[PDB]
Structure formats: C-alpha cells, structure tokens
Structure 1
Amino acid sequence: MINAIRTPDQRFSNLDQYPFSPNYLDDLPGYPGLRAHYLDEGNSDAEDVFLCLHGEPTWSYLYRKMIPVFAESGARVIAPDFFGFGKSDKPVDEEDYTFEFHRNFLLALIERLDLRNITLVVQDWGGFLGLTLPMADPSRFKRLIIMNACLMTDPVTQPAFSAFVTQPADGFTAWKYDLVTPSDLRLDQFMKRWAPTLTEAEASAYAAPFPDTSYQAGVRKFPKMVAQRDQACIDISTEAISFWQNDWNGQTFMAIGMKDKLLGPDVMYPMKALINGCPEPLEIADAGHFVQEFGEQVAREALKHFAETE
C-alpha cells in the first residue's frame, strides 16, 4: 500500500560494537508488506523486559552500550528499529509517516510479542511516542527510564515543550536545519556534530542504513513533526499528562544530559513534575542530547536505583 524499500544487508557488515543478531516481524496488523527489525537480547523468558525506544535520526545501534548491562542483570531487552530507521523497512514518501503510524506500530509490536513487566526506556522521539504507550494498556508497564524527552503537547497547556522549537537558534532550529534542508544529508557528519564524543567508526554506524537520500524520508519528516503537531498527536499527548500525573504508580529513573540545547533542564524539570513519583534527576554534566553515549553509567545507576526500592 505504502511503497517501501529495504537497505542492502551489506550496509551493516562493518558495524563496530554491534554484535547483536537480528529478529524480524513482517506481519504487523495495519503494517502490510513491511518488515521491522528488533533486537531481542538476554534470557527470552526473564520476568522483566527493557523495551528500548530510539529517536531522531538513529537506530537500536544507539542502545549498544546499554543493552548488555541490562541483559547481564537478568532482563530480556527488546529494541526495535522504527519503519524508516536502522534495519526496518522504509516507506519512500514523507506523507506516510505520522504520529499514529509509528505509535500504532509500537502497540502492534507490543501485543504481538506479548510483553509484560516493561521497563520503558526512552529518549527523543522514542519518548515522544513511547510516553503515550502506557495509558493504552496500563497492566503491562512497570517501570520507566527517561532520558531527555517530553510530550508533544500544544503550546497553551505546556509552554516548556513548545518553547525550545524557536529558541535557541543553535538548538532545535539548527537541528531541523541540518536535517530537512541538505539535499545530500550525511548522517555521519550530523552525528559527529551533535555527539562530539563519537569515533569515526560509531558515526559511520548511524549512516549505514542510508545509502542515498531516497532511504531518508523518515529521517526528514520527524523534525517536521515536532514543528507541526496534528490533532491526534495533541489529543493523545494531552491525554498522556493526565496518565503520568494521576494514574502511573510505577517506578521511575531520570537522567539529564545538561549539555543539551534542545531538551536539557528547561524541558526535564517540568517533565519530572508531571510523572507521579519521579525522583531528583541524575544530571550528567558532560552529556549532550544523546545521553545514551554515556550509556553504561546510566544503565548501571538506573538498575542500582531500581533494586534499592524493591
């Protein structure tokens, strides 16, 4: 229905620090003909599941230093690549990627594998979609590890989650420029600029899925979805506040990447207040937007808090 393409498998031969075996589902409901990739790691029978959600413009490769810490703890880690990202398939047209289209895919993935005992792990778009999951089926979520993210709300009801779109000009205005404007978007240069600590090898891992620009339509639509929020996304995200503030009784863990210009403190302190029971965040001073690149430290501490309150 949705014309889509798939990335040559050879694009991933040389990945650094990605020894994970691939799994695929290609029959989600609503998602015909489309194949999705996801990591399934650790004891595939563990009580606890860490569902790890990626954001713009990355993939599961992102969680790569986190995954094993979670597996070695005795958890099963799921870690899906969205349609248009990593190893999943990619619709060719930006008109096909919407907020529901990626959200429904999430709910579909969750039903299908039947996950329970979830410790939701979000950042970026992964949190924007991922934080609307719980109210869908509350009985299946038990914890949350939230890194630099928030809810796509409409200006009035939460100004902090709209404000960063316009100011600073070297924050979200700059991120969106680097993404939707180049005719020749090199995600290795982009990442090396938004994450100065990456090595040339890592950076190249984030361009692997995209050989040419026709593979990038979903890379392209995401910043624009931050900018232009449709009604469903507003209603849904508005409905999520209420759930995190009044319904949620789960355990949480927050880590802030203080060097972030898009979603640092301005956005994280206000989120910390709407999550019923969210404790004193963990401020990572040398980290940017991609907190997961100071990942092990997060994964470790997140599990250390997790047990000290069980």
Structure 2
Amino acid sequence: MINAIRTPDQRFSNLDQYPFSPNYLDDLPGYPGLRAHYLDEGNSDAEDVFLCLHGEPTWSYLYRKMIPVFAESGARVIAPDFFGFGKSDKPVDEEDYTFEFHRNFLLALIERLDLRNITLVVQDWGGFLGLTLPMADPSRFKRLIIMNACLMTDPVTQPAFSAFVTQPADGFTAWKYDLVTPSDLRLDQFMKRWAPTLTEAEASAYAAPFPDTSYQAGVRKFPKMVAQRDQACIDISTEAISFWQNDWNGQTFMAIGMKDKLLGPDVMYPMKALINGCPEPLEIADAGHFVQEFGEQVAREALKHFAETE
C-alpha cells in the first residue's frame, strides 16, 4: 500500500564491527507489506530488555559499541531500524513519514515482541519518539538512558526545545541544510563532518543502507519534521512532559555529548529538570551529537549507576 523499496543485501557485506544477525518482522499492524529489521541480542529470556532507538540519519549500527556491553550484563537488547533506514524497508515518498507513523511502528514492535522491563536507550529521533512511549503503557518501562534528545513540544511551552532550530547558524540550521538540500547526499561524508572521530570504514557503514537518493526519503523528512511539528506531535510530546515530570518513577541515567551544537547542555539541563528523579548528568567532554560513538563509556557507567540501585 505504501510504495517502498528495499536495500540490496550485498550493501551490508563489508560492515565494520557489525557482527549481529538480522531479525525481521513483516507483519506489523498498520505496516502492511513492510519489513522491519531489528537486532535481538543477548539472552532472549532475560528479565531486562534494553530497547535501543537510533535517530537521523543513522541506524542500529550506531549502537554497535554499546550492544555487547548491555548483552554481557545479562540483558536482552533490541535495536530496531526505523522504516526508511538501516535494513528495514524504505517508503519512497516523504509524505508517508510522519511522527505517528514512526511512533506507532514502535508501539507495534513492542506489542509484537511483548517487551517487558524495558530500559529505553534514546538519542535524537530515537528520543523524540521514544520519550513519548512510556505514557502509552507505563508498566512495561522501568529505566531510561537518555543521550542528547528532548521532546518536540511547541515553542511556548519549552523554548529550549525550539530555540536550537534557528540559532546557531552552524548547529541545526547547518545540519538540516546538509540533509535536505544536496541532490546527491553522501551519508559517509555527512557523518564524518558531524562525527569527526569516525574511521572511513565506520563512516561508510552509515551510507550502506542508501545506494541512491531514491532510498533517502526517510532521511530527508526527519529534519523537516523538527522544523515543522504537526499538531499530533505537539500534543503527544506536550502530554509526555507531564508523564516524565509526574508519573515517572523509574531509574534514569543521563549522558550529554558536550560538543553537540544541536542538543547539548542548553537543551539537556532543561530536560533533566522535567524528568522526575533524573540525576546529575554524565558530561562527556569529547562527544558531539552522536554520543553513541563514545558509547562504551556510556553503557558501562549507566549499568554502574543502575546496579547502585537494584
């Protein structure tokens, strides 16, 4: 029904440090005919599930240094690829991707796999979407690991969650320009700019899912949805603020990539106050937006904080 395309499997032959086996679902309710890929690592019977959500313009490859730490801890880790990214199917028109399309795909996945005792791991889009998930079924979520992300609320309710779209010129403005304007978007070049410590091989794993522009619709829509928040996103993100401030009673661990021009401290301190019980953030001086690239520190500290209360 949704015209979609699928990345050829050979594009992923030569991946650097990505030894995880694929799992796919093509029978989700509301997602007829679309195949979603997700990693399922560690013990499939563990009590704890770390649900690892990625953002723009990445994929589950992003969580590759953190996955083995969470798995060795005894947890089951689920790291799905949103449709339009990684190894899931990719709808061809940008009009098909909406906040709820991706949100509902997450609640569907979660119900489909019946995930319980979830430690939500978010950053960017994975947090814009992922932070509005617990209020939907509070009982299945028990901890949160939040790296640079916030809620897509209206400007008046939280100016901090909106100011970054316009200032500074080299933060979000540049990021969106680099993503929506080029008629020939090279994701390996994009990633090396925004994540300067990546090796060539790593950079190239981020361009792996997209052979040509035709597979990039999902990638182009995300930034435009940060810029143009529709009513449903606004409503639902507004309502999640209340959930984190008042309803939330789990364990949280926050890690800020200090060099992030997009969602660094001016956005993370504010988020930290709205999340009940959130503790002092772990500032990682050398990390930019992709906190995950400095991921192992994050995973072991989180697990250390979490054990120190369990």
- With the shorter chain as reference, the TM-score category is over 0.9
Secondary structure of 1:169's counterpart equals coil
Shift of 1:71: 0.3
1:286 aligns with 2:270: no
Secondary structure of 1:209's counterpart equals coil
Aligned positions, number: 310
- 1:141-169 Cα deviation digits (max 9, x unpaired): 00000000000000000000000000000
Shift of 1:76: 0.2
> C-alpha separation between the residues in 2 aligned to 1:34 and 1:255?
34
TM-score, structure 2 normalization: 1.00
Shift of 1:204: 0.1
Shift of 1:31: 0.2
- 1:209-266 Cα deviation digits (max 9, x unpaired): 0000000000000000000000000000000000000000000000000000000000
Secondary structure of 2:162's counterpart equals helix
TM-score, structure 1 normalization: 1.00
Shift of 1:81: 0.1
Shift of 1:102: 0.2
> C-alpha separation between the residues in 2 aligned to 1:196 and 1:42?
30
> C-alpha separation between the residues in 2 aligned to 1:26 and 1:153?
32
Secondary structure of 2:207's counterpart equals coil
| Residue of structure 2 in register with 1:101 after alignment | 101
**Which ranges of structure 2 fall in alignment gaps of 5 or more residues?**
none
Shift of 1:298: 0.3
> C-alpha separation between the residues in 1 aligned to 2:17 and 2:170?
31
> C-alpha separation between the residues in 1 aligned to 2:95 and 2:2?
10
- 1:108-149 Cα deviation digits (max 9, x unpaired): 000010000000000000000000000000000000000000
Q: Percent same amino acid among aligned pairs?
A: 100
> C-alpha separation between the residues in 1 aligned to 2:295 and 2:29?
33
- 1:248-307 Cα deviation digits (max 9, x unpaired): 000000000000000000000000000000000000000100000000000000000000
**Which ranges of structure 1 fall in alignment gaps of 5 or more residues?**
none
Shift of 1:27: 0.4
> C-alpha separation between the residues in 2 aligned to 1:262 and 1:128?
13
> C-alpha separation between the residues in 2 aligned to 1:276 and 1:196?
34
> C-alpha separation between the residues in 2 aligned to 1:180 and 1:291?
23
- 1:171-213 Cα deviation digits (max 9, x unpaired): 0000000000000000000000000000000000000000000
Alignment of 1:85-164 (within 5 A): 85-164=85-164
Secondary structure of 2:37's counterpart equals strand
Could you list the runs of 4 or more consecutive aligned residues of structure 1 that deviate by over 4 angstroms after TM superposition? none
> C-alpha separation between the residues in 2 aligned to 1:146 and 1:76?
18
> C-alpha separation between the residues in 2 aligned to 1:168 and 1:156?
19
Shift of 1:91: 0.2
Secondary structure of 1:109's counterpart equals helix
> C-alpha separation between the residues in 1 aligned to 2:200 and 2:34?
32
| Residue of structure 2 in register with 1:207 after alignment | 207
Secondary structure of 1:197's counterpart equals coil
> C-alpha separation between the residues in 1 aligned to 2:53 and 2:286?
22
Secondary structure of 1:206's counterpart equals helix
| Residue of structure 1 in register with 2:34 after alignment | 34
Shift of 1:309: 1.2
Shift of 1:52: 0.1
Alignment of 1:222-233 (within 5 A): 222-233=222-233
| Residue of structure 2 in register with 1:171 after alignment | 171
> C-alpha separation between the residues in 2 aligned to 1:171 and 1:281?
22
Shift of 1:50: 0.1
> C-alpha separation between the residues in 2 aligned to 1:286 and 1:107?
34
- 1:5-52 Cα deviation digits (max 9, x unpaired): 000000000000000000000000000000000000000000000000
> C-alpha separation between the residues in 2 aligned to 1:84 and 1:196?
24
- 1:62-92 Cα deviation digits (max 9, x unpaired): 0000000000000000000000000000000
> C-alpha separation between the residues in 2 aligned to 1:243 and 1:199?
40
